[PDB]
Each structure stands twice: as C-alpha cells, then as structure tokens.
Design an enzyme around this catalytic site. Structure first.
Site, PDB file in Angstrom:
ATOM      1  N   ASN A  23       4.591   1.148   2.836  1.00  0.00           N
ATOM      2  CA  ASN A  23       4.782   0.159   3.900  1.00  0.00           C
ATOM      3  C   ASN A  23       6.238   0.152   4.413  1.00  0.00           C
ATOM      4  O   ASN A  23       6.676  -0.833   5.040  1.00  0.00           O
ATOM      5  CB  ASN A  23       4.370  -1.248   3.432  1.00  0.00           C
TER       6      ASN A  23
ATOM      7  N   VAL B  47       2.580  -7.076  18.300  1.00  0.00           N
ATOM      8  CA  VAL B  47       2.205  -8.418  18.734  1.00  0.00           C
ATOM      9  C   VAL B  47       3.410  -9.193  19.320  1.00  0.00           C
ATOM     10  O   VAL B  47       4.463  -9.281  18.712  1.00  0.00           O
ATOM     11  CB  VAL B  47       1.645  -9.245  17.562  1.00  0.00           C
ATOM     12  N   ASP B  48       3.256  -9.731  20.518  1.00  0.00           N
ATOM     13  CA  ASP B  48       4.296 -10.547  21.092  1.00  0.00           C
ATOM     14  C   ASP B  48       3.671 -11.862  21.479  1.00  0.00           C
ATOM     15  O   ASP B  48       2.468 -11.933  21.724  1.00  0.00           O
ATOM     16  CB  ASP B  48       4.911  -9.888  22.338  1.00  0.00           C
TER      17      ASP B  48
ATOM     18  N   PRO C 186      11.883  -7.993  21.177  1.00  0.00           N
ATOM     19  CA  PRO C 186      10.520  -8.106  20.614  1.00  0.00           C
ATOM     20  C   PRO C 186      10.431  -8.988  19.361  1.00  0.00           C
ATOM     21  O   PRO C 186       9.381  -9.130  18.779  1.00  0.00           O
ATOM     22  CB  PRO C 186      10.178  -6.654  20.282  1.00  0.00           C
TER      23      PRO C 186
ATOM     24  N   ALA D 139      -1.009   0.096   5.565  1.00  0.00           N
ATOM     25  CA  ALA D 139      -0.682  -0.762   6.702  1.00  0.00           C
ATOM     26  C   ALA D 139       0.625  -0.305   7.333  1.00  0.00           C
ATOM     27  O   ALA D 139       1.569   0.003   6.633  1.00  0.00           O
ATOM     28  CB  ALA D 139      -0.597  -2.241   6.265  1.00  0.00           C
TER      29      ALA D 139
ATOM     30  N   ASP E  15       7.926  -8.138  13.640  1.00  0.00           N
ATOM     31  CA  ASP E  15       8.873  -9.228  13.896  1.00  0.00           C
ATOM     32  C   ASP E  15       8.860 -10.314  12.830  1.00  0.00           C
ATOM     33  O   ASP E  15       9.688 -11.224  12.865  1.00  0.00           O
ATOM     34  CB  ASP E  15       8.700  -9.834  15.304  1.00  0.00           C
TER      35      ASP E  15
ATOM     36  N   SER F 112       0.836  -1.228   0.000  1.00  0.00           N
ATOM     37  CA  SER F 112       0.000   0.000   0.000  1.00  0.00           C
ATOM     38  C   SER F 112       0.853   1.255   0.000  1.00  0.00           C
ATOM     39  O   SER F 112       1.726   1.446   0.853  1.00  0.00           O
ATOM     40  CB  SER F 112      -0.928  -0.009   1.210  1.00  0.00           C
TER      41      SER F 112
HETATM   42 CA    CA Z   1       6.803  -9.107  18.592  1.00  0.00          CA
END
Ligand code: CA
Lengths: 557, 206
Positions: free
Chosen positions: A241, A75-76, A205, A69, A252, A1
């Site tokens: 992006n 997120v982990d 992370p 995006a 990640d 995008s």
């Molecule tokens: Ca992560």
C-alpha cells in the site's frame, strides 16, 4: 495488503514467483472464496473476496494476477451552493439545477420503519454531515458510472495471455487498485489502475472545491498517466500500500501518507538481501514480515544517537541496547500469550511519548488527537487489520531525519529543544512505566503479544455468522487475510506452473440445521496458523486426480 | 452438451466449474457459492444495500441509512442494463445459479437450510444481477475505493492558519499532510519512470 513479484532475474528454480497477501481483517467464514472456472474462454483457479465473478487472486496457467489497494486520490469533494428559497436545487454554471432525489424506507425488524431522502448532484451523492442552509458537500468519485466496468475488467482480465491483453483490461478497471502480473516466461508487471480526475489548474486535491462550475474536473486522465512498469530493472515488484511511483500523490486522507517511513521497506530489504529467491524463500517473506515490528528500523538510529554518550548503568541506555540486539522479529513464548522480547512494548511506550511531546504538541486541538496513535493500539481480540507505521510516526520520522528529509519543517516539532533531550525524556518515561510494571530486570519481562481473531461480523460490522463461530489464533500475524503464491516454470515440477493458497477457516461456511458443521468448515485453520498452504489445481487431470466429489447439472436458460 | 454444468470439488472442497457458455459457467459458480456461503452472501447482500435492519433490528438503522446515502442504485441498474448480452450473462448466470440452489434449500429446509437462517429468524430469497453486482460494488468500490477527508483537512488547515498565520499555516499543513514526499519508497523505481503531473499545494481554489 502486500505483494511481491519476483521476475526471472531474481527467481531461483523458477522464472517468476508471485506472493499476494490482501489484508481486509480476519473473518469467519473466510473473507475469500476458492473457485475454478473452465469454459467459455476461461480456465482459471485461485480465490476471491465475496466470490466476485472475477478472481482477484489467481492464474490461468499462462499468467497470474493479484491486487493490493491503491490509495491514490480518486475522490474530491465539491462544496455545493444552496438556496433557502430553492430547496432541492443548487447553483451550477450560472443556473439553479435540480438535485436528484430519492425516497428510501429502512424496514426494521421489531422496529418502526424509517423513511428519508437521499440527494445527489452532478458531482456525486450529498453527504449528510456538514450541512447548512447554504452549503452541502458532494463526494465526487472519478470512478462514478464505471463500477460495472471494473467488475467486468476484473473478470475479462483472467482470459489475458500477455501484458498487452492484460493492460487492456487494467485500463478498464476504474477503482484505485494496484494490479500485478506474472507469466510462464518470467515476465512480471504492475499497474496502479484506476480513474483519476484531470483537475483544473490551481486545484489542491487535498481540499474541497466550489461546486458552482469553475472547478469541475476537466475529465479523466488517460491510461498513459497510470503508474505502471513491465519487467523492472530491479527484477522485482513489491508493494504494501506504499507509493506506486515517484511524484505520485496519495489519497487525501489526513491519516494516510507516503513518506520516508514506509513498511514496504521491510519487503524490499528481504528481496534484495538475496540475489535470487526460491518459491519457499519467497513464501517465507510472509512469516518474516508478519512478525516484523515496523517502528524499530525507523527509530533505532535516533535512539542510538541519543543514548550513545550515556554511562553503562543508565537505564535509558539499556533499553536502547536491548533494541539494538533485537531483529524486531516478534515470537511467542511457550505460554502462547507473551512475546519473547519486550522490544515492541518499549517502542510503543517511547513512541507514544514522543508523539505527545512533538507532533501532538504542535497541532491545535482537537486535530492533535489525529497524530497521537503509536500504531500499536489494539483490543483483547487483537488488531482488526494490518499493522502500519502511524501517521504521527511518519511525521516524527521526517523530523528526526533533520536535513535528510525533503519535507521543510515549517514548525519545529521539537520546539527549540535538542532532539536528544526530548528522545531521552521519552526513554525516561518508558523506563519509569515499564520498570514499574514488569520490574527492573528487563531480561525477564514478558510483555503481551497481539492475538488474531477471525470475527463473525464482516468488515462492515454486520454478522455473517453466529457469534460462537468466531475463531481465535494465539499469534497475531501482520499478513494477508489469505495468501496465495503462483510459481511459473518451476524447475522441480512436471507442470509449467504451480500454485498454492490458504482460505481460513475453510472453503465452506455451511452448518446443517442440526448444527453439523461441513467437512470443509475449518480444515484450513491450523494450516493458516503455521504458515502452511495447499495446492491450487488447474488442469483437468490435476482436478480429476484430487477430486473429492462431483455433480453434473443440466439446465436450459 | 451446451446445457451441461459439471462441478468437481477438490480435497479442500474447492469447486471447479466446467461449462460450454458464459451463462452456464457462472450459473455453476453461483450454485456452489450458494452451497458454500449462503448466509455470508445473504448478509453481504444486506450490508451492501443497507437492508440489515430488516433482519437484525434497530441497532443497524444508522448503518443502513449510511449505506444508502453512499450510492445511487438507479445508476448501477442503468450500467447493468447497458451491458452486452455476453457480460450480462455473467451476472444473470451467477444470479440464476444461486437461485437454483436457493429454491432447493427453501424446498427442503429441514436438511438444507443453513442453521444461521434458523437462528436469525428468516429465510433466503432469490437474487438478481443487481444483487450480484452490488456485492462487488458495495465492497470493492463504495468501501475500498471511496476514501476522502477533504472537509477535515480544510478544518485542520484553517486551524493551522489561525494558529501560525497564513503563510506559516499553509507551510505546516504541507509538513503534516504533504502532497508528495520524494523520499517515499515506491513500487516502481525512479530509474523506470516518474509521475509527470504537478499539483497545487496552496489550496489555490480559495
Ligand atoms: Ca481529493
């Protein structure tokens, strides 16, 4: 995008220009939905994916907005400690805590229904994969519990009339999305929105953390931390992006990287090329980026260095000379199936060979497979999304930069061999391969172009139409599923704002029981193909003047 | 009239809704969506909730299971119940608008029912705020903001450390999957600002 926002300092015959190309693949009917809302505080026009209440791509005559995006790391994964003697529990803060659970039944047409349990902890839902008697991983999203807030933030932002009112809503959107702003006075803005966790010291992370308690997130970082810029010195805001900001870490995902090699340079280049751009020039950046081979610019110098000392007749030399004369802008031949120049095929073969020889060679199996893609892989129906520089290619790019790369080459992807030699061996492979296929006269090589398919299955792979409804376009275009441009204070118009978009195949996906297709079932398809666009109306007078039909409803809640 | 919803379509069939309050505005929005993309929205509803097999069969069971394993419906329902009346009106109105059109479709299916419904062998039912919300939640969130491969990453690192030794292994992981790369082209120029947080790149959590 992708997205480019051109401010007053760089806009010609206007004060601000916004061109957005969200890329989710191509679908029939259209991925986005055209809608105009007028009343209860709203006054907007534009289009939006799946007809979300909030328009992701649109304007309100005062400001305009868009998204791409974000791909930040929000997120982990927490490794939860289980006990065979306590099924359904997990150790947290020194106590066996009871997991949340629910029964679900998959009803199956013409099949036997299936019942199963879904489990969740304080960190998130439990993954199905990678389970043992003693461990289970939970996917922890920083936006957990803020889904609705993001849906509404996306709605309410449409009523904003300035940067302060708009960033107030950007602060409530918790998903990892880049938001963009522009207004009738020439101001432009950008915010990498989203909730990001405030991680314990020592928490890497990119890797899982124990879920026993000591590694739980401290909370979420405040809005102050979110990358943002208002009226940048550059006079423009461009994104594909790529990284929001220096030192800001990516997702990640092992296959995702923000490095020296980034396709966004392709946009920066065209925007800086000209001191000022007009609306039509800004729009033309779509057509150019959509045809731009993304690897040529990254590896051409390396190719030149390796072949700079060879004699005229060396075929490796002529392959590189062919690339040098090329702008990397692919065009279809008259046949509508092959490309005018064989450059991308050359780069594809060569690059595939380089990765095998270097990155793939240094990574233990089966992880080596993750770095083998050239980025040209596709099927008969063409790419299912945007084309990008592959992860292997980005790694290779740092290696060929030598000391110009800030990334320590712990291991030598060239394993002691001179880079020239390995680059030449790959060029040799390329020549054997293509000359064997197309003959030894490069000038008459007609290599295959990529095509584009508007699929009847949505991005999930679930039919959203009958198969026969699939549409086809000869020329693949690395561009937005939809493209919309908003031009603020255009000097050649009587309006303080002009806007255009294209929703292909059309506004409607309706087909009558007898098979009669709606009038707006496919009226935007050719327009999409030739980089055309249609006006988006906002004011009452414009809408009224361009009315096709009207209907009034009377309803008591 | 507070209860009047005007729908005007332009030369491309694009709808413009005119309404006095929130509920009526989004009622008009849902109404036109139902008119324009009913089958697409129904199937998107099924995709985001994991109920595709109900109509498509066994080849989508695994799909369904994966969708449901990726979210917690009750939590979404709770966020919806916590909504202010004004925000609730957005979803309720949208849901209601769709239902008005859907009721007319189910009343005169021989002329209004999209052909795909006949073809796929089922009829559309009514929507609730949850349904509307999940369209967005299941796409934008559960799919476009839910990316991670940390388990795979740990496996790669583990294999790198086995192959190159510990210190070397760590170093090569930081070469293939760097945390940050300062030469990365950024949307915000270095002259404007930089991100102030520094992260651990040694997997010190072990
Ligand atoms: Ca992560």
């Amino acid at each position: 995008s992708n997205m480019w926002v051109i401010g007053k300092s760089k806009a010609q015959d206007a004060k601000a220009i916004m061109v957005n190309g969200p890329q989710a693949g191509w679908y029939a009917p259209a991925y986005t939905y055209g809608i105009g809302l007028h009343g209860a505080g709203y006054d907007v026009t534009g289009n939006t994916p799946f007809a979300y209440p909030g328009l992701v791509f649109g304007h309100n005559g005062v400001i305009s907005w868009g998204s791409t995006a974000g791909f930040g790391d929000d997120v982990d994964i927490f490794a939860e400690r289980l006990s065979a003697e306590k099924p359904g529990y997990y150790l947290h803060n020194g106590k066996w805590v009871k997991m949340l659970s629910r029964e679900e039944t998959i009803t199956v047409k013409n099949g036997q229904a299936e019942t199963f349990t879904v489990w969740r902890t304080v960190h998130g839902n439990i993954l199905q994969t990678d389970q043992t008697t003693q461990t289970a991983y939970a996917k922890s999203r920083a936006w957990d519990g803020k889904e609705l807030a993001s849906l509404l933030a996306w709605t309410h932002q449409m009523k904003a009339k300035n940067w302060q009112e708009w960033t107030q809503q950007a602060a409530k959107q918790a998903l990892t999305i880049n938001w963009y702003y522009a207004d009738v006075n020439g101001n432009i803005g950008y915010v990498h929105t989203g909730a990001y966790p405030d991680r314990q010291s020592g928490h890497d992370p990119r890797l899982p953390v124990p879920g026993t308690g000591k590694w739980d997130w401290k909370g979420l970082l405040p809005f102050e931390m979110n990358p943002k810029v208002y009226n940048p010195q550059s006079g423009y805001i461009a994104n594909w992006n790529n990284s929001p900001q220096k030192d800001y870490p990516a997702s990640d995902l092992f296959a995702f990287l923000w490095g020296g090699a980034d396709r966004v340079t392709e946009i920066d280049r065209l925007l800086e090329q000209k001191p000022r751009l007009t609306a039509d020039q800004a729009w033309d950046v779509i057509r150019q980026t959509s045809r731009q081979d993304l690897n040529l610019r990254l590896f051409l110098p390396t190719l030149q260095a390796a072949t700079s000392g060879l004699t005229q007749s060396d075929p490796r030399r002529q392959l590189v000379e062919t690339l040098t004369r090329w702008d990397g802008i692919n065009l279809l031949n008259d046949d509508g199936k092959t490309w005018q120049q064989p450059g991308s095929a050359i780069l594809n073969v060569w690059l595939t060979s380089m990765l095998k020889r270097t990155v793939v060679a240094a990574v233990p199996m089966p992880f080596d497979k993750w770095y083998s893609a050239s980025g040209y892989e596709t099927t008969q129906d063409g790419p299912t999304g945007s084309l990008n520089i592959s992860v292997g290619a980005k790694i290779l790019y740092e290696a060929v930069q030598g000391d110009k790369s800030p990334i320590p080459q712990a291991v030598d992807l060239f394993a002691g061999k001179p880079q020239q030699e390995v680059v030449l061996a790959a060029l040799e492979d390329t020549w054997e391969t293509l000359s064997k296929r197309y003959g030894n006269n490069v000038s008459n090589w007609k290599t295959p172009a990529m095509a584009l398919t508007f699929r009847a299955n949505n991005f999930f792979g679930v039919p959203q139409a009958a198969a026969e409804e699939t549409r086809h376009q000869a020329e693949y275009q690395n561009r937005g599923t939809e493209n919309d441009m908003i031009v603020f204070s255009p000097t050649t118009s009587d309006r303080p704002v002009l806007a255009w978009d294209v929703v292909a195949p059309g506004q409607s996906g309706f087909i009558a029981p007898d098979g009669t297709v709606d009038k707006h079932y496919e009226d935007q398809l050719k327009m999409y193909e030739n980089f055309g666009r249609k006006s988006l109306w906002l004011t009452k007078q414009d809408v009224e003047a361009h009315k096709e039909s009207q209907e009034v409803l009377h309803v008591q809640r | 009239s507070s209860s009047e919803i005007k729908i005007v379509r332009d030369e491309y069939g694009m709808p413009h809704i005119y309404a006095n309050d929130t509920w009526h505005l989004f009622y008009g929005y849902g109404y036109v969506v139902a008119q324009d993309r009913l089958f697409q929205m129904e199937m998107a509803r099924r995709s985001t909730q994991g109920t595709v097999a109900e109509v498509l069969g066994k080849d989508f069971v695994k799909f369904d299971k994966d969708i449901r394993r990726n979210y917690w419906p009750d939590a979404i329902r709770a966020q919806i119940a916590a909504l202010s009346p004004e925000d609730m009106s957005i979803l309720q109105g949208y849901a209601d608008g769709m239902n008005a059109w859907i009721d007319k479709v189910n009343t005169n299916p021989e002329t209004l029912l999209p052909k795909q419904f006949n073809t796929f062998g089922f009829t559309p039912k009514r929507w609730e705020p949850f349904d509307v919300a999940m369209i967005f939640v299941g796409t934008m969130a559960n799919r476009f903001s839910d990316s991670t491969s940390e388990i795979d990453n740990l496996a790669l690192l583990t294999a790198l450390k086995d192959k190159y030794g510990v210190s070397q292994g760590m170093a090569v992981f930081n070469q293939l999957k760097w945390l940050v790369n300062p030469s990365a082209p950024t949307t915000i120029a270095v002259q404007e600002s930089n991100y102030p947080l520094k992260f651990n790149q040694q997997n010190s959590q072990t």
